[PDB]
Design a protein around this ligand. Structure first.
Ligand SMILES: *[C@@H]1O[C@H](CO)[C@@H](O[C@@H]2O[C@H](CO)[C@@H](O)[C@H](O)[C@H]2NC(C)=O)[C@H](O)[C@H]1NC(C)=O
Ligand SMILES: *[C@@H]1O[C@H](CO)[C@@H](O[C@@H]2O[C@H](CO)[C@@H](O)[C@H](O)[C@H]2NC(C)=O)[C@H](O)[C@H]1NC(C)=O
Ligand SMILES: *[C@@H]1O[C@H](CO)[C@@H](O[C@@H]2O[C@H](CO)[C@@H](O)[C@H](O)[C@H]2NC(C)=O)[C@H](O)[C@H]1NC(C)=O
Ligand SMILES: *[C@@H]1O[C@H](CO)[C@@H](O)[C@H](O)[C@H]1NC(C)=O
Ligand SMILES: *[C@@H]1O[C@H](CO)[C@@H](O)[C@H](O)[C@H]1NC(C)=O
Lengths: 172, 320, 320, 172, 320, 172
């Protein structure tokens, strides 16, 4: 996809993550955990809500009958009306197909971008204390307990504290 | 050896297929329909002063067919016409029929104004027929008097009848012309004299002569009564000069304001509300498109040649 | 010093210019046309039971102009009308001509049914003209009869002719009114009496008076025959009352099913198939748009006011 | 462009790469290498094939004549038909121009994204063993023979095998 | 402490709100309007050979109402019609009036051609009225002749006149039928005989009878002159046969080429140019859309049901 | 947004930057400075100019009157004209709304991409001599005077010149 995360360097989604669209799984000395990310999830949902608000509607134009259900109308004007209505149908059928195809492309790529923006925020946060494994994970080169893992998820992780330890382990 | 934090996204066991610019079979976590496939088999008339004509055809309201006796006048914002509805009890048709029907179904009511037409002793203004009945006896179109000469064979006299439009709005006047089945029938009803019917206003001048010719038996009758109509402008007058064959108007019509005309087979429901109607009933969907019918009236989703069109409401579904 | 791996993309010697949202002159590796600019100067008739009318005008098929002798009846899914096709050997025109032409060009065939009209001994029903020649002999419209007084100068007798539609489908009946060049011509054919033609059915009432007047000489005649037409509904009777000037039908027509009408100058080709036709031939393109003509029939690409619209099928072309 | 690679940090395309849309050139002791990347190439081709399948088609709506080629139609209805047909032509011309402009923008940007995604995949594979030159190349700080180069292309390169050698050359 | 380079983008104190696919209220640094809401309250006629008809109704140009004396002939690429313009100095109306008005307003000019019609010594062919004043004297329609009996009460002589179109282009011919206000008026002008008017060409046939009737007083008159029109094809002859009541043409019209018809209330401005006109004036916007009126002529922005649609011309505004 | 820079990792815009759309702020021993980037600014402006050239335009189709301002037309043809014109208005209103919504999304995301492309260009230039602070800034681990800062902005900064000093300061 456009941003290379969803159906990209992230191998697959987590069916187990029922409390969000994006989030984190961790492994440290204490064990493993999973948590959803609220801000990224809500950013994707809000943008999709915006589309539904714009798309799920009709015009307030009041149309009246120009065709009889139960009787014959003039043949020649009937031919003009048939040509016109079929021309309008072809336009709306085409417009509908293009709208949904275009919107669907954008929805999928927008969702991809939100996954990458979270990945990128965490990368810049960890600075020189972690390395990418190419699978959507960061290998952290210091002891990072449950409170440390929370600081990363909460966007409050301070790289400066762990830098000396991380660089020693990275360079051996 | 080193600790790890992994970033990910959700998936679902049962994803949904949508189309994109690039992919005809793209699986996403969720999608929603944009084309309405379903309708209510009922006319949702809540918040509308509506009129259900039933067996009464709109044109029957103006000429006053027995079937239309309850719909000769009134006001409405919505008018509902039904299939097989009756206009003509006596066999025949209106010239420029569809134009009249559309004008009535465009209207927000019908007012009736007396022509004030009164006829000499030589004329009986109560001609009746088996084809048009009410109260278990031969009758006629309520809004037109069938003018007959008293003596069989005796000439219907040269009569003049003028309607003056004293109103500030145009009035719709209708009249019928008789077309005998046999040369005998023509001479029987209106005499041997060569019949002529002239209709003259400032904006309308026309001449009618009953064409003698045997048509097929319809409602047990071989002859025909064909209807004609025009508009009388404010302050103008329309004159009928005739010597037999004219079916003369007793009242003229005024169409009041505007309303929504609906042609539907679906029964009335006063409990529910709608802005969109078709032959099959009411469309109350919030979706932008519909595939029920290209023929709708009101504020409607746009018709499309599509069964389904799914809008993605989630990311790519990449299951485990 | 260090080993090196470089990531890159292809380029081509000859790129193609396309338009984007932001750039009028974007060079890409490849593009494909979306607007068809070329047509086959041929009517692609493979898989079609087609009739090429050639010199025969659709209306000529119903009245039986000599040019149409091989097109009086038939069945087809495609009917092809040509430029300068002949309807009228005797100079004249049809009232509501375009409506009749379109109705024929919508049909899937024509059947002919005898009227069975007979005429009194004082009527010559075999009127012919040098204008309507067959095999070097004076003739007439095959489907109609020129009725004149048997004795030159004698009053044409008061005549009544009735056709009943015995079929389950509507029949198309046509008749002519003869408009003589001079009073002498009128008197010679029909006599000095006042001429009147009445036509009456359930669905059609009209009256005609022959209008004496010299028109420009066309096919050697300054007189005219003008044609009128109506549909006779199943079971209905249509009556002709006339005393001179009626050109009476020998046969009525029945239009069978539906077909595609094409007006084109392009020759038939049985080797190629098509669903889209215009004046200049057949459009077999798979492209969504065409700039050949806004006038097409069948299943067609949409007309656009553009010579070319190139769709990119490759990345930006960045040559070294 | 949107993804900054094609007509971006990659100076120009390779006319000599005739077996793919994207790929690799390399230099080591063993020799000079070039190879197309199949996956990225086929992703771009398949997405453009998707567009052609969508766009290169007409409606199956059957239209009949409402204008005579060879005779006069009624002047007043003719004026209405002229207005309607010209209005329909303006809509299709506009829709055709917007469709191709939008699709062309997306095709170019999509192709750019597939280049960047291949580049990003390589960056993550090489980890701390290579540095970006800013021109779409990676300078590899260990002996990387034809098998090593192939392993990068084939996504089987193990950064740990060469890490000690690489860090030694990078830092000293 | 490391040195620092920071990358950033601009912002403005007060950004503009635009709509996106996902956001109803997206703030950006700059935006521009796509829907034109303003019109020039003038008709911009620079570069146009225009004719402003003022109080001359297009139909008045053909029959020659005094108000149209400056507009009987000429050439133009633009013809401007005004509200309440005068066609009929003598009270009456034209049959198929709107069709005729449309044809004139599509034209690029009018030529006039003499009919050459003459009348016997017992006809006064210069009938005038106080209703049609010209040069401070009783006059009539410039292009028609009111034919009456020279001797009050005497029978109007049977007359036949023929116009031949000697041109290679079609001509437009008009005539009136006088409908007297009383029997005394009818008898004085045309005599006591029965009045009949026949009009015949190759393409047109009709019959008229003066209907005597006292109509509402319009311009001080209870009588009416009603107008009829037809096209005369190249080379054709149209014949008028009449014995009283015909208002005969002295000239026929040729409509020259094509022009832009404008119906507007806006004053002419020869200092500004435009391609787009409506009731209220000229639209010279470069914008693709307009919300002034769905009724425009020329090369125009498309009408939309929108006050405003702002197109972003800058990034998201993220102020300090 | 899509590229995560504008209204993303860049906290806010600079109201003080009046000579360009994108640019630099630096801090060294000599003090602070601001300069617009011409190439990124011109890339964004040129693309928006392209949109305006395409969008700010009408068709040259000459429409004539099929409705009288001052008189009655046939009621039946009037009903067909009303249905047709209202159908055409609903189409153009829809097309106008979709055009501007889609173009606005793309304009915002395109401007975001040009901000990220300038950031990425500087990242690759600085190579191992600087680190990302996650706010759109690079901490430069050597003395970088006004000439050095200008060389980063001018795209002529040679990382190899400062590499030894930088790695020593980064690792310590
Ligand atoms: C306009 O189109 C309608 C619908 O396509 C046509 O109505 C159909 O006519 C055929 C006869 O060929 C019937 O078999 C169908 O039952 C009709 N369908 C409906 C829904 O009414 C109609 O014939 C066309 N109008 C004209 C003037 O040709
Ligand atoms: C409808 O539009 C067509 C095409 O513009 C008109 O036909 C043209 O009329 C001009 C008259 O100046 C001729 O010179 C052209 O040769 C015609 N072109 C074609 C293709 O027919 C037509 O007049 C318009 N219809 C009406 C009723 O005005
Ligand atoms: C076509 O639509 C127009 C505009 O909606 C109608 O004209 C209006 O008619 C109403 C009567 O209900 C008047 O009160 C308005 O003043 C009219 N507006 C204008 C601008 O003319 C017109 O009636 C419709 N045509 C038909 C045949 O119904
Ligand atoms: C590497 O990839 C190429 C291209 O798909 C393939 O042909 C080859 O077999 C692979 N090489 C090895 C040694 O697996
Ligand atoms: C803002 O408004 C328009 C473009 O939308 C233009 O005239 C003006 O120069 C713009 N000013 C800026 C971007 O500062």
């Amino acid at each position: 996809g456009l941003f290379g995360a969803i159906a990209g360097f992230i191998e697959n989604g987590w069916e187990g993550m029922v409390d969000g669209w994006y989030g984190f799984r961790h492994q440290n000395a204490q064990g493993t955990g999973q948590a959803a990310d609220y801000k990224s999830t809500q950013a994707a949902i809000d943008q999709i809500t915006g589309k539904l608000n714009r798309i799920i509607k009709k015009t307030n134009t009041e149309f009246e009958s120009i065709e009889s259900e139960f009787s014959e109308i003039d043949h020649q004007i009937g031919n003009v009306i048939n040509w016109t209505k079929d021309s309008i149908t072809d336009i709306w059928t085409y417009q509908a197909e293009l709208l949904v195809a275009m919107e669907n492309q954008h929805t999928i790529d927008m969702a991809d971008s939100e996954m990458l923006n979270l990945y990128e925020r965490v990368r810049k946060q960890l600075r020189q204390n972690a390395e990418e494994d190419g699978k959507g994970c960061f290998e952290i080169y210091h002891a990072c307990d449950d409170s440390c893992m929370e600081s990363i998820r909460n966007n409050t992780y301070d790289h400066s504290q762990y830098r000396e330890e991380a660089l020693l382990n990275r360079l051996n | 050896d080193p600790d790890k934090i992994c970033l990910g996204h959700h998936a679902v066991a049962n994803g949904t297929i949508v189309k994109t610019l690039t992919n005809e079979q793209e699986e996403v976590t969720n999608a929603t329909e944009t084309v309405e496939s379903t309708s209510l088999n009922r006319l949702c008339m809540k918040g509308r002063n509506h009129k259900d004509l039933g067996n009464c055809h709109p044109i029957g309201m103006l000429i006053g067919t027995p079937a239309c006796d309850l719909h000769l006048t009134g006001t409405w914002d919505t008018l509902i016409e039904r299939k097989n509805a009756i206009a003509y009890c006596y066999p025949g048709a209106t010239v420029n029929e569809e134009a009249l029907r559309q004008k009535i179904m465009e209207s927000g009511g019908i007012s009736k104004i007396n022509t004030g037409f009164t006829y000499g002793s030589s004329i009986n203004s109560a001609g009746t027929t088996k084809a048009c009945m009410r109260n278990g006896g031969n009758s006629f179109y309520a809004e037109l008097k069938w003018l007959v000469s008293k003596n069989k064979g005796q000439n219907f006299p040269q009569t003049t009848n003028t309607y003056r439009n004293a109103d500030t709005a145009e009035h719709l006047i209708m009249w019928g012309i008789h077309h005998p089945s046999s040369t005998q029938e023509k001479n029987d009803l209106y005499g041997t004299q060569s019949l002529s019917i002239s209709v003259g206003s400032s904006t309308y001048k026309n001449n009618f002569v009953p064409v003698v010719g045997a048509r097929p038996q319809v409602n047990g009758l071989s002859s025909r009564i064909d209807f004609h109509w025009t508009l009388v402008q404010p302050g103008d007058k329309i004159t009928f000069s005739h010597n037999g064959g004219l079916i003369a108007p007793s009242r003229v019509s005024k169409l009041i304001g505007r309303g929504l005309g609906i042609q539907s087979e679906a029964p009335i429901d006063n409990s529910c509300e709608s802005k969109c109607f078709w032959r099959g009933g009411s469309i109350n969907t919030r979706l932008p498109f519909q595939n029920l019918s290209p023929r709708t009236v009101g504020q409607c989703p746009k018709y499309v040649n599509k069964k389904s069109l799914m809008l993605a409401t989630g990311m790519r579904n990449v299951p485990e």
